[PDB]
Amino acid sequence: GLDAQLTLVDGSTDDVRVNLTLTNTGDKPIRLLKWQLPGSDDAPLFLVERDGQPVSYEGALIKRAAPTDKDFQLLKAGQSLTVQAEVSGLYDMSAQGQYSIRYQLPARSESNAITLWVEGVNDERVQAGSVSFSGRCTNTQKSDLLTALDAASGISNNASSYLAVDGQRYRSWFGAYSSARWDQAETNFSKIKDAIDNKPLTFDCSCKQSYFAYVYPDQPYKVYLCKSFWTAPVTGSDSRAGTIVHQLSHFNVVAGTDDLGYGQANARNLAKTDPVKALNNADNHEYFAENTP
Amino acid sequence: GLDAQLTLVDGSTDDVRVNLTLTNTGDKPIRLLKWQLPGSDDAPLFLVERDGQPVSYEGALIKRAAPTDKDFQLLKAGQSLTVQAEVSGLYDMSAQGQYSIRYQLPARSESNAITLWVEGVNDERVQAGSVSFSGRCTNTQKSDLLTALDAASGISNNASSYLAVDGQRYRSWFGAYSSARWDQAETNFSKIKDAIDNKPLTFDCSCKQSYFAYVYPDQPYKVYLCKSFWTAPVTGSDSRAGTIVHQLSHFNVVAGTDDLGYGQANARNLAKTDPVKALNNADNHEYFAENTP
Numbered sequence: 314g315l316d317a318q319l320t321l322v323d324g325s326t327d328d329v330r331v332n333l334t335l336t337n338t339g340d341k342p343i344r345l346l347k348w349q350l351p352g353s354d355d356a357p358l359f360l361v362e363r364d365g366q367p368v369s370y371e372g373a374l375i376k377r378a379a380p381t382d383k384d385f386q387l388l389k390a391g392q393s394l395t396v397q398a399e400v401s402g403l404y405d406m407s408a409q410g411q412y413s414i415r416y417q418l419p420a421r422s423e424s425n426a427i428t429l430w431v432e433g434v435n436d437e438r439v440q441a442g443s444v445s446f447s448g449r450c451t452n453t454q455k456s457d458l459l460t461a462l463d464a465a466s467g468i469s470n471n472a473s474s475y476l477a478v479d480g481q482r483y484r485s486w487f488g489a490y491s492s493a494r495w496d497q498a499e500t501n502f503s504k505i506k507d508a509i510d511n512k513p514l515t516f517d518c519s520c521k522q523s524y525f526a527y528v529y530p531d532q533p534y535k536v537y538l539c540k541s542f543w544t545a546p547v548t549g550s551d552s553r554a555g556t557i558v559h560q561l562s563h564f565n566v567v568a569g570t571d572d573l574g575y576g577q578a579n580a581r582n583l584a585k586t587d588p589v590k591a592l593n594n595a596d597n598h599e600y601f602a603e604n605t606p
Numbered sequence: 607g608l609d610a611q612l613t614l615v616d617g618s619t620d621d622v623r624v625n626l627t628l629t630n631t632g633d634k635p636i637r638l639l640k641w642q643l644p645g646s647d648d649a650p651l652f653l654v655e656r657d658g659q660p661v662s663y664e665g666a667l668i669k670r671a672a673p674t675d676k677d678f679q680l681l682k683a684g685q686s687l688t689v690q691a692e693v694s695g696l697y698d699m700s701a702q703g704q705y706s707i708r709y710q711l712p713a714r715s716e717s718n719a720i721t722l723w724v725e726g727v728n729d730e731r732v733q734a735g736s737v738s739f740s741g742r743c744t745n746t747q748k749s750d751l752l753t754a755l756d757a758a759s760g761i762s763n764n765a766s767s768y769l770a771v772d773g774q775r776y777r778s779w780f781g782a783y784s785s786a787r788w789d790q791a792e793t794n795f796s797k798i799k800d801a802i803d804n805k806p807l808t809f810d811c812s813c814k815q816s817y818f819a820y821v822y823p824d825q826p827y828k829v830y831l832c833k834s835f836w837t838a839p840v841t842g843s844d845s846r847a848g849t850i851v852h853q854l855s856h857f858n859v860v861a862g863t864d865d866l867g868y869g870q871a872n873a874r875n876l877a878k879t880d881p882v883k884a885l886n887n888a889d890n891h892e893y894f895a896e897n898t899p
């Protein structure tokens with residue numbers, strides 16, 4: 314027969330990783346549908362409950378045709394296959410509480426349940442402004458993102474306060490003074506602040522490219538984080554907080570900023586060279602907010 | 607110096623491919639910022655105008671740090687590099703008319719302009735219901751998708767009409783009759799029809815996986831098409847039209863269908879075995895609408 318044993322992995326992030334051992338206890342090989350083994354494609358393979366109530370599935374749903382021979386994994390007689398899954402990135406395990414997790418048996422009926430207390434992401438934005446996730450953001454990621462968002466709120470309020478008392482910081486990132494350009498920058502930060510505070514934001518963690526993040530400017534307010542987001546400091550230069558300000562600025566409904574080159578020296582040269590371009594550049598907005606130093 | 611020559615590629619799809627030749631005409635190697643050469647990462651590298659007016663950039667915007675040595679491409683003295691780009695997937699070239707396209711010179715100022723008449727995607731949905739795109743859908747793709755959408759509308763109206771006169775087709779895909787389950791199916795198709803007709807749909811062409819499509823059920827109404835969408839027939843079994851019905855059915859605001867296995871035999875067994883599961887399965891909805899035969 315087919316035996317499925319789930320065990321919790323011990324670690325010190327807030328992620329919820331599990332080891333699933335599937336074992337052919339019979340005497341002839343069996344075939345397991347690969348789409349129903351945990352892996353890089355999303356499917357709802359687990360029953361996740363908090364305090365006896367099902368939580369949301371948070372992954373994608375795929376159309377696949379009927380499977381063919383190539384779609385099945387062979388397990389020999391006696392043989393075990395162990396696969397690890399991170400569960401918090403595919404089910405909503407954001408609320409604190411006692412959870413049970415079982416795996417459903419793949420096509421050729423459940424593992425044991427495991428149970429654990431989950432600290433959760435203790436934030437009203439995840440339970441006007443809200444924050445949702447996709448692309449397998451784990452509890453640690455979600456928590457890191459909310460942290461980054463509060464930091465971003467801190468620097469976007471600080472930018473906005475600076476701009477409300479109508480100037481080196483402005484000079485550095487936006488160039489020679491004009492009231493029209495200052496009012497424009499102030500309007501941009503007002504809208505960035507209003508998105509941080511009040512809009513339905515979405516962060517996605519699927520991107521593995523080496524840069525920081527990307528958005529589609531006509532698809533508010535979903536920000537895709539990439540590898541350099543995670544390696545960046547929460548605050549300071551080219552920081553997580555600053556990245557959020559950068560990316561939010563691109564949305565057509567926020568500030569419609571452009572990509573007019575990349576980096577601090579680029580940004581400084583724009584300011585010195587062509588204030589109108591600086592006013593239209595995401596980086597200049599980020600660096601004005603980061604104000605580091 | 608650096609010379610940039612753009613030429614149009616002749617072909618018989620509606621895509622707009624161009625060959626960009628960059629040439630170091632000087633005597634020492636030069637370095638070209640790779641991020642500003644056309645490639646797999648989106649940036650707005652071209653000036654695209656229709657009838658002398660700029661059209662929208664339709665690609666993503668990325669945060670990158672200042673570039674380092676590794677980010678520059680070397681071009682030797684005398685040397686040319688030719689790179690091809692498809693332009694309709696990154697700028698809005700959906701309206702019929704006369705277009706000019708120039709490339710902006712990368713960091714180390716424009717190519718010649720090329721001009722061409724573009725047939726466009728001649729559809730009010732792209733100019734209540736609308737259709738937007740991301741993930742580099744070309745004019746041919748956009749046109750194929752609108753075609754598929756009209757086909758999907760055809761089969762979703764036909765499903766809805768069938769369900770309005772209150773039964774083999776129902777039996778095949780939804781199992782034994784009950785008024786509650788029939789009303790539920792009718793409500794599901796009413797909402798699928800209303801999304802096809804009246805909602806802001808988004809199709810994305812970036813996915814290269816071998817299956818048909820995927821959605822996030824909490825991210826309406828963006829459908830990601832994958833390789834099997836393009837190889838599928840427009841109508842019939844496992845068709846483009848049917849895929850759209852499948853995927854739209856998954857959205858929480860449409861019909862909240864599940865992924866309860868994959869394929870026609872799966873679907874038929876659900877119906878025979880467990881009508882409540884069939885009523886909750888995307889495929890059963892697709893196959894009921896495809897009704898092939």
Ligand SMILES: [Zn+2]
Pocket residue numbers: 374375376377852856864865888889
């Ligand atoms: Zn599906």
Ligand SMILES: [Zn+2]
Pocket residue numbers: 559563571572595596667668669670
């Ligand atoms: Zn950017």
